[PDB]
Design an enzyme around this catalytic site. Structure first.
Site, mmCIF file in Angstrom:
data_model
loop_
_atom_site.group_PDB
_atom_site.id
_atom_site.type_symbol
_atom_site.label_atom_id
_atom_site.label_comp_id
_atom_site.label_asym_id
_atom_site.label_seq_id
_atom_site.Cartn_x
_atom_site.Cartn_y
_atom_site.Cartn_z
ATOM 1 N N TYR A 1 -17.546 31.519 43.320
ATOM 2 C CA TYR A 1 -18.275 32.301 44.317
ATOM 3 C C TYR A 1 -19.494 32.923 43.646
ATOM 4 C CZ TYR A 1 -18.415 34.265 49.027
ATOM 5 O OH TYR A 1 -18.766 34.593 50.315
ATOM 6 N N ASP B 1 -18.572 26.822 32.504
ATOM 7 C CA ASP B 1 -19.060 28.197 32.497
ATOM 8 C C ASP B 1 -18.102 29.006 31.634
ATOM 9 O OD1 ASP B 1 -19.748 30.861 32.949
ATOM 10 O OD2 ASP B 1 -20.418 30.475 35.008
ATOM 11 N N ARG C 1 -43.354 23.874 27.392
ATOM 12 C CA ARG C 1 -43.611 25.107 26.649
ATOM 13 C C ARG C 1 -43.629 24.756 25.178
HETATM 14 C C1 LIG Z 1 -21.417 32.802 39.259
HETATM 15 C C2 LIG Z 1 -22.401 33.873 38.867
HETATM 16 N N1 LIG Z 1 -23.214 33.649 37.809
HETATM 17 C C3 LIG Z 1 -24.087 34.617 37.453
HETATM 18 C C4 LIG Z 1 -24.206 35.831 38.136
HETATM 19 C C5 LIG Z 1 -25.206 36.858 37.689
HETATM 20 O O1 LIG Z 1 -25.591 36.534 36.363
HETATM 21 P P1 LIG Z 1 -27.144 36.677 36.003
HETATM 22 O O2 LIG Z 1 -27.510 38.105 36.302
HETATM 23 O O3 LIG Z 1 -27.308 36.368 34.539
HETATM 24 O O4 LIG Z 1 -27.938 35.719 36.880
HETATM 25 C C6 LIG Z 1 -23.367 36.053 39.239
HETATM 26 C C7 LIG Z 1 -23.408 37.295 40.038
HETATM 27 O O5 LIG Z 1 -22.904 37.428 41.146
HETATM 28 C C8 LIG Z 1 -22.465 35.061 39.592
HETATM 29 O O6 LIG Z 1 -21.653 35.273 40.655
HETATM 30 C C1 LIG Z 2 -50.777 23.297 37.106
HETATM 31 C C2 LIG Z 2 -50.293 24.121 35.942
HETATM 32 N N1 LIG Z 2 -49.740 25.330 36.191
HETATM 33 C C3 LIG Z 2 -49.316 26.072 35.144
HETATM 34 C C4 LIG Z 2 -49.405 25.642 33.815
HETATM 35 C C5 LIG Z 2 -48.906 26.517 32.701
HETATM 36 O O1 LIG Z 2 -48.782 27.835 33.211
HETATM 37 P P1 LIG Z 2 -47.486 28.664 32.773
HETATM 38 O O2 LIG Z 2 -47.507 28.703 31.270
HETATM 39 O O3 LIG Z 2 -47.605 30.047 33.355
HETATM 40 O O4 LIG Z 2 -46.248 27.937 33.280
HETATM 41 C C6 LIG Z 2 -49.970 24.383 33.565
HETATM 42 C C7 LIG Z 2 -50.109 23.826 32.204
HETATM 43 O O5 LIG Z 2 -50.338 22.649 31.952
HETATM 44 C C8 LIG Z 2 -50.412 23.632 34.643
HETATM 45 O O6 LIG Z 2 -50.961 22.416 34.404
#
Ligand SMILES: Cc1ncc(COP(=O)(O)O)c(C=O)c1O
Ligand SMILES: Cc1ncc(COP(=O)(O)O)c(C=O)c1O
Ligand SMILES: Cc1ncc(COP(=O)(O)O)c(C=O)c1O
Ligand SMILES: Cc1ncc(COP(=O)(O)O)c(C=O)c1O
Ligand code: NA
Ligand code: NA
Ligand code: NA
Ligand code: NA
Lengths: 375, 375, 375, 375
Positions: C94, C166, C42
């Protein structure tokens, strides 16, 4: 370059700083100044500046202005006058413009004179010594009366009037009032320009430096400015304006052919018909058509049945969406006017207004015709 | 419940349809109606409705209104009058309100009478038979003069005036004019309410059903409405208003103590000082303080040096940000007024205005004091 | 400068091009390059770059990474390993992390070893020759077990492990793992960092140049990037993090005092209690507390009654909102585990978890106590 | 109904609660549940649900999935396999898909077999007992090789493979793999679907209930979800997909006619040319053309001169914008491959790739031809 190209490459919509191909959204209220002299006594939001640049470019103007609604745009232009000043408008003006002028600005001593502008000599008869502005919608709503823009501009220059055209129904893609001598062109960008039923906005363009200066002062003093997010979506929507208007125009021609031949349909109002008043004027000042069409079925219950029978026309009051829209003026926009004055102005009970969207032409023709066949 | 709780649970800011704990952003311009009767003759954007509900709740009003700027809010309230009507304002009003009234609305025959309202008897002397409105900022800018809100409300009721308070500097967290008899309270929500320098907005609250009806009509007829995205960010920002104002107040008290003791500092203007005019009135109508403070250094070059020496005060003209801001009125907001009238009204060349942000109190006190020590 | 100041002025969140005090939202996918050499094989979205800069600054790291969820962040960090590699985690992990590792990444041959890390010697016993990563939540959910971060960092360095913390429950405001030797710190920014229940996001910070390079490669190859609008709202929300955490901490102390004294309440889990395991460790690595508290009522129907009786605690499963939240682990997060294993790990049927929000402290204490009194 | 109609009225993109004609943006992370049983153990964001509904409808699938990038979509589909599983891909795959598979997922023991799929018998020869997936781009990049989708679907069903088509270059408007037996269709919605260079997104559609269930599990466990704002802009952009693709196709036909006749141009690659390999297959599985065209000028300096001479083709690496884009594979996408392998695969130094935008056809033909004439 041709128009579809100018829609893509005209104006300043890229970011010079990063090279971003779309204009950044400046969700901000404050800009830091390097030294205290720069803060002499709105600071230009660059997203709004981008959309003002687009509207100035598309109308061949020099200055663009973005307001939080088309009503705010009209309202700002009217505030160019003082108490005691007179403005001439086309006499079938209604809705937001009419309500603003007759219920708000007459309380500030701004006098309104309504005039059938389909005959420009009516303008000349209506001019008083207090007249300062000539404000024209063309084509108008809902019967699409056409006014000679160039001649109105000539009359306005000769008598010292600010000339204003509401160019919402045509868009800059098909009609450019500034090219015909008009001082100010404006739009409810909520309609075709945004094009997706998701932005409420007004846009104003001018080439007059002094008028632009007064508009900027009014804008900064009354504050009806468009936000950065809506400015962004407006520029985005304007990208496809040419493709959308061209689809709409193809469907408009086919649909009119169907209506003129259908038994359940009587009068049809659209500036493309030869028998329409000032059809030659319209062809002379525009190179395409609006997507608003009006036509008469027999009575109110036929109108309501038409609405219920169509699969692809949606009941709503706005216009310029990607969806085709259907309405009955006499029950909606003009229900307040007493029935006999309605009848006397053309707003019969069987009058239907449609706004052609960008669905497939065959589908829209066939849907409307099967609905009409149920009558 | 106490205030910090009401900031979180007051108003309607959740979604009934899905249970969403934040209010959806209705980036739309059109709502479909089930049957044609519902379309009698702006349709309420639910995101804007949410913020109007919040401002009505926080001010103990019944009706809220959101405008695209504080200037649009003031401008809408002034359009409650007609040509020939008179409005009394506190005489140190300047900036947007003053410019709007004296350069726009006098052209519509609305007459402005400026009055030192720190003495309510001045209001009574100024009342004419054409007077319809009493409009009060308190505390005012940049010298923070305090007006007795309750007494002004009494005078307005007795003489049939619409009373209006600009409550921007205090916010609903510390001062509630509607609770003291005022008819309309308004805000530049761009400042403390949004709180993050990223929304331009005005907010108006009232308990008067008929005034609310006229405000709604003016809003829908002139179109200075707040967009859905800005409405969303405004509600979001208002969530932390209590925490931000309380931090700002802690820093305000400490900073004032430092200024009153510093050699390079002469007069200090803030309603918390006992010797400040109407300090008792302010304590009686508010339960906290604004974050705007003004104080005098010796001359313009001391002011500019102060600005350059501070690490945490940023040069800018707005207020109510999370960042602390610094400005010199005589070179910025009031540079247009001739030097001697400035001097005669209090705007000496060494006057500095700061807006306290939410940085650490010790850092802001120490930074300002080390800057002052360089004088 | 102190922390509340760093929250406002740290990182790059202004616009260098225009001076805008908030970072522009680059709703774009493409940046034009001046000449063809710049397009090697990106591209950094400047809004996302701004939030990555903030998280790197707040954690005293060198490199920040923004993912479309905390799960995407964890998932990206785990993809630093290959099939056959082993990762040690604290054994009460968990939810998202556990589900990702045991149902997705074991299918790719990444082996998981769960370990009670409240004793760092357990880590040393668990180290195999295939172990590559040590991943620690502290305090953990829902019983808030505390792990010695510094000692875990020492063990990881000595045995060649990537150490990961974390840090969601503490936020960078109270605990900085990178300062204690940890290689990577991450967050579900959905919680306290965004702070307003309106952004789903993950954030990762590191000082290791080579780890940062591998993270950037994984990010650009698997594509779980945060969008510009969410990046903007995340930076905005982080502005008030200090004020919110400090309010939450004040309420946490008062609420715990109430719970420890109430008859209907048995065990209370929070690292602030002296009798809590590793309370001294927590005080040594953090200078404040999480807003998550767990406590035991008598049984499931007491828990459900508590939920129904509270006016200000809202039933929901997330945490870190401005609203206070309430949940019952055994019926929600851990309902899948059979009842006896639940009981054996601490998840009794009367266990309640609350997330303290930013309402008024007295209101939250009194509401919870009146609810408990109904038992 | 025809396609342009289905683009407007297909899927669920309105709001049932308010009648809003565009889908609300749910900038939220949490939904309140009425009673505790509803919280069994991502909750569907209604804006994302709307875009998933659109992509399922346009591809005649049953289930849609939105990812934060096309790379995240591919990456999620590949995680349907385990270590030891084999996937067959067309052998000219490069860029994101190739990098993901060969630099990320081979580290998890997923084996990649590249195959010239322009001959489906090559697929049959490549099938091993560990093969689980057949993944096909058609037409491919940058030489637009065409693979028989229906025959590949037959082979996949017969041998128990999950079949996957990357349908980015054709869009659902012109080619529907699910209608030809394929199990999963996916898109980099960043390209034609969004259509405005302002959304990074991936989209996946299927009719298989069990595959959909596994995709939902992978999505919720690894977290590469599209945000609500981007989901909104994606639906918005998809509204004009038919009009944009049809304009692009008109320009494609004219431009190809110009290239085939120009002296400075040698080979031209596009599936519309009769002499192109599998032209008959393409006509049999699609009813229109991609806007990507490749052609050979004489050498690198001719390519660079072409880029510099064009007024309307912009140098950039992406595709599917409203602007026409120009690139040189051998210096950009494939510069890493050694020159002789490039030459041996078709990526000569004079190979140019253009992405036709929606500018006026005459302007694009004439601009490219005047540029070529400068050689
Ligand atoms: C360990 C952990 N990380 C992240 C999440 C959710 O965070 P997010 O919504 O940003 O993915 C949860 C929810 O159950 C979790 O248990
Ligand atoms: C095969 C393929 N898919 C997707 C992308 C980029 O798409 P996106 O920006 O949605 O990830 C590229 C860029 O090089 C690509 O080569
Ligand atoms: C003349 C006129 N202008 C504008 C509008 C509405 O446009 P906007 O929503 O942009 O204010 C109306 C609606 O009735 C109208 O009648
Ligand atoms: C009285 C007054 N109101 C409002 C403003 C600006 O507020 P807003 O940006 O919301 O229009 C100013 C700025 O000078 C002002 O002086
Ligand atoms: Na002119
Ligand atoms: Na009252
Ligand atoms: Na280290
Ligand atoms: Na099938």
């Amino acid at each position: 370059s041709n128009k579809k190209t100018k829609l893509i490459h005209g104006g300043h919509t890229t970011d010079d700083y990063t090279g971003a191909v779309t204009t950044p959204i400046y969700q901000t209220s404050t800009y830091l100044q390097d030294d205290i002299g720069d803060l002499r006594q709105r600071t230009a939001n660059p997203t709004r500046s981008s959309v003002e640049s687009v509207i100035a470019t598309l109308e061949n103007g020099k200055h663009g202005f973005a307001f939080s609604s088309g009503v705010a745009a009209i309202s700002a232009v009217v505030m160019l006058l003082d108490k005691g000043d007179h403005i001439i408008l086309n006499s079938d003006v209604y809705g937001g413009t009419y309500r603003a002028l007759t219920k708000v600005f007459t309380r500030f001593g701004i006098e309104v004179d309504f005039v059938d502008t389909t005959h420009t000599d009516s303008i000349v008869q209506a001019i008083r010594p207090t007249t300062k502005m000539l404000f024209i919608e063309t084509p108008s709503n809902p019967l699409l009366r056409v006014t000679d823009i160039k001649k109105s501009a000539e009359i306005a220059k000769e008598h010292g009037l600010i000339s204003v055209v509401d160019n919402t129904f045509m868009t800059p893609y098909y009609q450019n009032p500034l090219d015909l001598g008009i001082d100010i062109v404006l739009h409810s960008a909520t309609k075709y320009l945004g094009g997706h039923s998701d932005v409420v906005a007004g846009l104003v363009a001018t080439s007059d430096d002094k008028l632009a200066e007064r508009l900027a002062f009014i804008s900064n003093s009354t504050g009806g400015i468009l936000g950065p997010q809506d400015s962004y979506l407006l520029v985005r929507g304007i990208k496809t304006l040419g493709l959308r208007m061209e689809q709409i125009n193809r469907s408009v021609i086919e649909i009119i052919k169907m209506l003129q031949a259908h038994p359940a349909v009587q009068q049809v109002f659209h500036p493309s018909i030869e028998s329409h008043l000032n059809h030659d004027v319209h062809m002379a000042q525009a190179d395409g058509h609006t997507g608003v069409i009006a036509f008469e079925v027999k009575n109110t219950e036929s109108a309501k049945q038409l609405i219920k029978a169509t699969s692809y026309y949606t009941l709503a009051e706005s216009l310029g969406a990607v969806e085709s829209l259907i309405s009955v003026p006499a029950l909606m926009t003009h229900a307040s006017i007493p029935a006999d004055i309605r009848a006397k102005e053309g707003i019969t009970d069987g009058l239907v207004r449609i706004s052609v969207g960008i669905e497939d032409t065959e589908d829209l023709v066939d849907d409307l015709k099967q609905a009409l066949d149920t009558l």
